[PDB]
Symmetry: D2
Subunit: 376 residues, 4 copies
């Protein structure tokens, strides 16, 4: 009598022709490949500049809320409370705009499984609203950690070693939110909006590290954040956006309690040109058995997800880089172009998720790379 | 009684801390590693934007003319007539600013050679001055071709199959030069300066193709240039600059008439993420015997030289890219970041020469990649 | 027995905090200052880069269609067929993002007028859909002209001398639309998307000139467009956008058949720093009686509307400018920053509409400046 | 028996076609309009991006050192110790690249004066070298102040009310200089290079304010700098550059001890569109007797010199501006385009000096505007 599962994850990498193009998703729903009701996350690469004044993130979010609210017959607020819309801007270099759709299929009666291994589990969860004076600070850290521990448990992911990627959409500090904080008698972690994105990304990432036991609580405080880059998560991927003031989190790992045919793995890029780490992540998901991946192996890849940054020590493999003191082009623009190019050249596909700004996500100048792949 | 050589090439990849930093070169001359009198080409990657208003190209040129004129006790004009100063702007992504010094050692009495194979030959040559109405048109094509055929012969490179890289510094059309042409009763190939860079690069590249028998003269005319991308050289690398109105050419290949321990090889990148072509060029120079290069093999690499461009069909491996309709960041900026990232991740060194704009240099969206490497 | 009017225009300059901020408009409707049913045009300054990949134009359009469709209880398609959403990107320099709401109040029984003069008349009209091979060419010219003549008549604007500003939203050629045209056996006026914006703006502007008798039909053909800048309209203001393939036109002038207290006037800026033309337009609407406008006079200004461009001869008042060969910053970005700065410094308010790219709109390097002002 | 003078200043506004174009200056020397030996300052507007990676500043400096060293028969080091080469990058909007040449003619026997008034006095002076840990801090403040007080005295400028413009070239902190400071056991005022430019500009400006009695010493400390913008000089204009580690200062005012026909005046722009302050500065130098300047009056203007910045409160005349959270275009780029446009439209000439970044120079969001003009 076969083994059985109540839960199954599906993942779909969908090309987008511009920030408002929901048609690849509508096609899959129209064709019954996915059910709108089972979507839990839309993870976008939108082709704005990926920095402060990137409005394609909110544009794409709005475009998807309109589609899903009308497809599901609910309000835009409800759909927003039901699906995490996580839009990472900046599609530099060859990086192809797209979105990844995550679905969870829950069956009241179990459906039989064919292989005994663990399979992809994903669980979305939202934190409480933060006040602006909490952004970039320990209340964002610990609330995120609490949410991550909870999502793990509810997904039936056994322990932190089975978590391979935690994606967060986190707030940033606009000038208005800063004023709000001051007018109420508080300070903010920084008075520059662009810098606030790294603070928000960093604090969220350390929450993940805290939740997975990768850092000790007693080594964390406000003054560590964006400062002590010996502290980090190996699976954290955080993306700052203008819209919300809470954190939207999707935990991704493997679990025996899930059926289906997707698994996930990860490695740690030690820097932005560490293609060996890329091949190792592929290998862990059975997509690079030898030195170089084969075409069949690469056809199992659903998508690759990575974080990129300009090495803050100014160097890559003891060569000076120019990404940090370039007044025309922000460092994250450079960094995303690089890391997507490295991954694209290994998996032969520029349509992969690469998000900039990896404060406390991997080592400095590096970041996590995760692969979701089919088992056959 | 050993075989013998009159000619020997040396090549030195020198870090630069900013566009005026000649100190790495001064160090090698001060230490007697090279002789100022035997330098024939300084090939720079200067950290300006690499497009029209990139003044680091002329800055670096000026800085080197001052150093060499004073080191050689000649005027800046004479040093400029003696050394080709070929400055390719744009050091995007991880690309590390640097210059490559080429020297030719001529000995009246031959010096004995140890291995019988062909060795790196390089030969600099300048064309006549062009009028602005000749830029981007058949007189730039045929003069370049004549110069390339001559440089080959004088270098003792047996035939086109032994040429692996032809580097050109070519003019561009400023608004003043355009007016000059009109006031004299002529037209120009384009009235936009940035577009004129592709016309100048393209015409120069087809001269190289003509010289090496890669295209037929009867298939060339003005209307082909930047238009028919089925016509191209596999070894051409051309870089437009504001300074001169002639073409400065350095032909690089292998020859039995040269001693030393450097060889060169090349492959054709079919697109900007074609790392297999990169590994093939390494393999041809004995630096990638198996699937992945080893650390010893990579230590033989002196430098890698490549051309990069945004695929003009809008696509990379059937994925849409955004490089061509990005009003904030020029396509060549994107493309250089990509191709240097791909090469850097394979050879483990971001200090490599990657020049943007590959009209008629490789297939559309692609370009040549050449490696100069030590034989042991 | 007083004179009487069936028609009255209102205009409201509304600050926007970001591209999706419809709240200033919702406030005026909630308060009953305007009636949603009487809005005919939303003219936006959205804070994207104002060039090809400016997605705030469509974002803002989408945000307003959602608000109005839900306020009016119609579909987004119907609201789009009822209101012209004309979004001009690029808010450089001090230029403050905002929108201008235009309303037309029609009364079946006339309402009495107090002053006998002409008053602001505005009339929206849409052309037919264009095929991509018509963009930038005589069918866009003549269809626009037909639409302008019709809007004038239906508005009861007596003749071209009473037209002071014709605002158009016109298409641009994406790579897909170009392919469509070729696959059907046709050519396009240009194969570059950014250049296609000037072609679309130019053709639309000459339609306006044709309609108002400012150019002769026999002097127009495809080869004139973006080429012969002695041909132009003094009241045309055209803005290219990615969304539609028709032209949306709003004609603005003065008419005895309209009541209310708004008038409009215009002058022609001879170049981008022609503040005397700005003061002349103010004077024509009674807002600059002496050399310098007073605070009361400036308080009558509802908004100012202007076109800006980088002088294509490379010069402003016989000084070289750098706007055209700047690879980091598009010329229209520079030009909008300049012209808004000049106007803002004269009217003491950076919240004014300045749209880039004035092909055939005013003389080369110049453009129209119109003022809508209250009569007291 | 006439009054008499030992000292006379000349000023020449010279167009430049590119950063290396010294020919307008060579022409004036060749023609004997100026004597190379009497040049004390070359004040440039060079057409780089005016931020961190603007290499046209050093390029232009190098180009002028080569010309003058060879014209004067001295070394480049000596010419650099003899002339202040003050290169302000960024020629945005219509701003025309150019340099202003300042000369001082000293005569052992006095030359008779025709008018009794004060005339332009200018005095160059260099501070000591700073260590990087002194940049942006009180030792830069007080050394600058000492140098300013000394230059004033040696120029015979009676008191601070006769000083109208103090131009400084000040250092910035590269990553290397920061490391130097840390390795020696010290901190730096900031670890970002771009931010270090404002710290260096700010500290230098407060030195000027200290020297002229515009701020009290007891209100200054390190923590005030870039923080308390109620502290500022009304005549300070400071420009950060990569080259030196000292400050090069030129004090400009009026003095009875100077002959000639140039005077200088200044006003304080309260914000970036304060054209009334521009007209007031003109009026003080007899170039705007009525509301609007006349053509003859404007022909007396040799040049105008101003500082520009993006209002750090996010607003201009209670309108939101976008200059500070624009990741594509630095705020100083925007601000320079604006202020040069405002001045150009008033004096009818875009060739004027406008330098970005006015920390402690005028009120926040504003800056000084000075005019040097002929008396007839
Ligand atoms: Mg990291
Ligand atoms: Mg090519
Ligand atoms: Mg025009
Ligand atoms: Mg200030």
């Amino acid at each position: 009598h076969h083994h059985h599962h109540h839960m199954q994850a599906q993942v779909f990498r969908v090309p987008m022709s511009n920030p408002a193009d929901v048609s690849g998703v509508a096609k899959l729903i129209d064709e019954g490949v996915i059910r709108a009701e089972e979507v839990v996350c839309v993870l976008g690469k939108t082709e704005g500049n990926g920095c402060v004044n990137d409005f394609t993130r909110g544009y794409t979010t709005l475009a998807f809320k309109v589609y899903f609210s009308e497809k599901l017959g609910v309000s835009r607020q409800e759909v927003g409370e039901r699906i995490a819309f996580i839009m990472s801007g900046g599609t530099e270099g060859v990086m192809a705009p797209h979105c990844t759709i995550f679905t969870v299929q829950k069956t009241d009666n179990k459906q039989k499984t064919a292989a005994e291994g663990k399979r992809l589990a994903v669980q979305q969860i939202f934190t409480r609203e933060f006040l602006p004076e909490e952004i970039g600070r320990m209340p964002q850290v610990t609330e995120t950690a609490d949410a991550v521990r909870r999502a793990m448990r509810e997904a039936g992911i056994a322990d932190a070693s089975d978590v391979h990627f935690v994606q967060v959409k986190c707030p940033l500090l606009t000038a208005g939110r800063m004023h709000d904080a001051v007018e109420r008698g508080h300070t903010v972690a920084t008075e520059d909006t662009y810098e606030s994105m790294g603070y928000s990304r960093g604090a969220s990432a350390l929450g993940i590290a805290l939740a997975l036991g990768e850092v000790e609580k007693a080594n964390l405080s406000d003054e560590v954040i964006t400062a002590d880059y010996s502290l980090y998560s190996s699976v954290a991927s955080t993306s700052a956006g203008i819209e919300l003031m809470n954190n939207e989190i999707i935990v991704m790992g493997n679990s025996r309690a899930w059926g289906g045919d997707l698994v996930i793995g990860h490695a740690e890029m030690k820097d932005a040109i560490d293609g060996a780490a890329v091949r190792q992540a592929l290998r862990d998901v059975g997509c690079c058995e030898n030195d170089l991946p084969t075409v069949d192996e690469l056809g199992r890849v659903v998508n690759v997800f990575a974080k990129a940054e300009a090495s803050p020590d100014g160097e890559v493999r003891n060569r000076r880089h120019t990404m940090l003191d370039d007044s025309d082009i922000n460092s994250t623009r450079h960094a995303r172009a690089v890391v997507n190019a490295v991954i694209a050249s290994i998996v032969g596909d520029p349509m992969v998720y690469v998000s900039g700004g990896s404060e406390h996500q991997g080592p400095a100048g590096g970041g996590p790379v995760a692969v979701i792949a089919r088992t056959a």
